[PDB]
Design a protein around this ligand. Structure first.
Ligand code: MED
Ligand SMILES: [Zn+2]
Ligand SMILES: [Zn+2]
Length: 354
């Protein structure tokens, strides 16, 4: 039995090592055999998903205006580490806790010294990931306290659920985007006396997920006009949509906090001492998983900024700065991970919450 607040690892709650299925849906014999052959993989996803469900339920109980963004992320991450039973690269946090505010939709997590305080009128996107053996759960929701954003939230949730319903083996990615867009734009909202037709953020998308690879190569667009490339049996996708009251386009903005090794870059010998050490720290602790500066601090690293810049300039590491729409705009996000199994579509991260 899990504690409140949560402290019992998910592994210890299901002793037989069999974890709960997410929501299974029929798509819009030999395949059953093929499905069962990868059971250990689905099971890993499911373990990671249960951890995600329990962490997020916990976060929803205490997240409140008044808290610093740092306090929020540290409290969330602490619980996540505990429930996933962090163990080097075999079990852990898949990527940093996004807590993007307002016009900012994605890739913001505070660095050391950030004094930002969560406000009553803030619209905060909590996007965090867990993994078991590199089987990643990428799942996200939006937190508000002012009911004025209720319809904006409902639009994006509906858009995400539409994307999830439309997804399937042999489904064209461009169709999913068109579908998402149609639902999203069917919503109009009124916030502080102004009305808006909700728009999808056109340069943001969902994505295929691979082992230790958050962005495996295929993208799921949230507007019409994309690639007719088809989804394939066995693939795993992060179905995420973002709605905005602004331009519906994001740009890089603010201090960068998120970084991730380029998956395709091989071993590179480095003699520069600080740069060498940092790359070793990244290889040991994150591999190709994304990390943030706070995660370097926590490992006792200091004076690493120039080394990190070197790694970026070399193309060994890529920076992922916050992506924000225009000043004054509001953005919302909902996201789930789905498994395109041979016998069905599993919304693995589905919970009783969203
Ligand atoms: C790179 S960390 C953020 C990861 C995931 N939420 C994405 O944007 O694909
Ligand atoms: Zn995400
Ligand atoms: Zn994602």
């Amino acid at each position: 039995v899990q504690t409140d607040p949560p402290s019992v690892p998910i592994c210890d709650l299901y002793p037989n090592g069999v974890f709960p299925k997410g929501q299974e849906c029929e798509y819009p014999e030999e395949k059953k055999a093929l499905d069962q052959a990868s059971e250990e993989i689905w099971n890993d996803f499911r373990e990671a998903a249960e951890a995600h469900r329990q962490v997020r339920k916990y976060v929803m109980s205490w997240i409140k205006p008044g808290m610093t963004m740092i306090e929020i992320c540290e409290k969330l991450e602490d619980c996540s580490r505990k429930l996933i039973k962090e163990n080097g690269l075999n079990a852990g946090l898949a990527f940093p806790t996004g807590c993007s505010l307002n016009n900012c939709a994605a890739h913001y997590t505070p660095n050391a010294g950030d004094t930002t305080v969560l406000q009553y009128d803030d619209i905060c996107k909590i996007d965090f990931g867990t993994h078991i053996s590199g089987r990643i759960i990428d799942c996200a929701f939006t937190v508000t306290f002012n009911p004025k954003y209720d319809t904006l939230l409902k639009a994006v949730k509906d858009a995400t659920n539409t994307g999830i319903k439309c997804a399937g083996i042999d489904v064209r990615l461009c169709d999913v985007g068109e579908a998402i867009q149609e639902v999203m734009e069917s919503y109009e909202v009124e916030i502080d006396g102004k009305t808006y037709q909700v728009k999808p953020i056109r340069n943001l998308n969902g994505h295929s997920i691979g082992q230790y690879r958050i962005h495996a190569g295929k993208t799921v667009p949230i507007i019409k006009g994309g690639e007719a490339t088809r989804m394939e049996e066995g693939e795993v996708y992060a179905i995420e949509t973002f709605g905005s009251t602004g331009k519906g386009v994001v740009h890089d903005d603010m201090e960068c906090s998120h970084y991730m090794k380029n998956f395709d870059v091989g071993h590179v010998p480095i003699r520069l001492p600080r740069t060498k050490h940092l790359l070793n720290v990244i290889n040991e602790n994150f591999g190709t998983l994304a990390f943030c500066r706070r995660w370097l601090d926590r490992l006792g690293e200091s004076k690493y900024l120039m080394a990190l810049k070197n790694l970026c300039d070399l193309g060994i590491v890529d920076p992922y700065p916050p992506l924000c729409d225009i000043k004054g705009s509001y953005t919302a996000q909902f996201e789930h991970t789905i498994l395109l199994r041979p016998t069905c579509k599993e919304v693995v991260s589905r919970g009783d919450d969203y």
